[PDB]
Amino acid sequence: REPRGLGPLQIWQTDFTLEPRMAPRSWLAVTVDTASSAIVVTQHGRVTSVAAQHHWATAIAVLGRPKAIKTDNGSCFTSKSTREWLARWGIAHTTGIPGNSQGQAMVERANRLLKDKIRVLAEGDGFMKRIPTSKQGELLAKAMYALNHFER
Amino acid sequence: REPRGLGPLQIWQTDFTLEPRMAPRSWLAVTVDTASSAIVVTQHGRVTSVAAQHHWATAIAVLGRPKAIKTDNGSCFTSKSTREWLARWGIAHTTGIPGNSQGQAMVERANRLLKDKIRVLAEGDGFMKRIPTSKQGELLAKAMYALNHFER
């Protein structure tokens, strides 16, 4: 229930964003923890309900189980499969207000910081276009570290 | 748990705003239901923990019990009394991120629409300064109706 004392509620925003620098697994599933601004990102060869559940499994290992997750109305998020996986985990789910305007501005911003940092780290290593496959995992983890941890 | 299907989470934002047109009970306690934008406002002679609980009792009769309520760090919201009253009701409570910037922008906007509508309805009835005490309850309920219900 409580958000840990008066602290922010454990609510996540999750989305998928396409990043060809990461092909063939160019579908990046990104979660932003709304209380701490922490971000979890994983790569996927296809945008599907199952890819979203593999991504939430990893985000759950990294940040803990949330009380609720916010997403858009994508089929990979409203499928019977995905609802059931979130029901199995005890996580509430919302797609927001029908005509929400857009409510998930934090995940959108996360999407943009990530593509920019990926581009900057990749160009730093000489990769001006698609990152060679064997170099992608450590570069993506490097971009996730860069936006999460500030030695400060 | 679930927000009713994929609908918005039952989360409220509550605050107090001072309105001398309503003296002596010039302290308006306002709650905005974040999923529907509905607003509940009650008047109070003083800003205290108890006034906030009387206001939530009324908001609960009008909108139902919420899963969580967001407020600032006012003493009337972090007192042992208020925490206990919310714990008695099973409602989670958050004051947000310490240095949240300000997270409760919806209640702030609600505060402004309300003072403006109160001023407009009062000037419409010839009351250019404090509203006579005996006319306040129906004018405040009138401003709450005006911002909640659109015959559309």
Swiss-Prot record, chains A, B:
Needed cofactors: Mg(2+); Mn(2+)
Protein origin, superkingdom: Viruses
Cofactor note: Binds 8 Mg(2+) ions per integrase homotetramer. Zn(2+) can also be a cofactor for the nicking activity, but not for the polynucleotidyltransferase activity.
Domain Integrase catalytic: 4-152
Residues noted as binding Mg(2+) 3 in the record, renumbered to the chain: D15, D72, E108
Entry text on domains: The core domain contains the D-x(n)-D-x(35)-E motif, named for the phylogenetically conserved glutamic acid and aspartic acid residues and the invariant 35 amino acid spacing between the second and third acidic residues. Each acidic residue of the D,D(35)E motif is independently essential for the 3'-processing and strand transfer activities of purified integrase protein.
Function: Catalyzes viral DNA integration into the host chromosome, by performing a series of DNA cutting and joining reactions. This recombination event is an essential step in the viral replication cycle. Has a strong preference for using the 3'-OH at the viral DNA end as a nucleophile.
Subunit description: Homodimer; further associates as a homooctamer.
Protein name: Integrase
The species this protein was found in: Rous sarcoma virus subgroup C (strain Prague)
Gene: gag-pol
From-to range in the entire protein, with total length: 1332 to 1481 of 1603
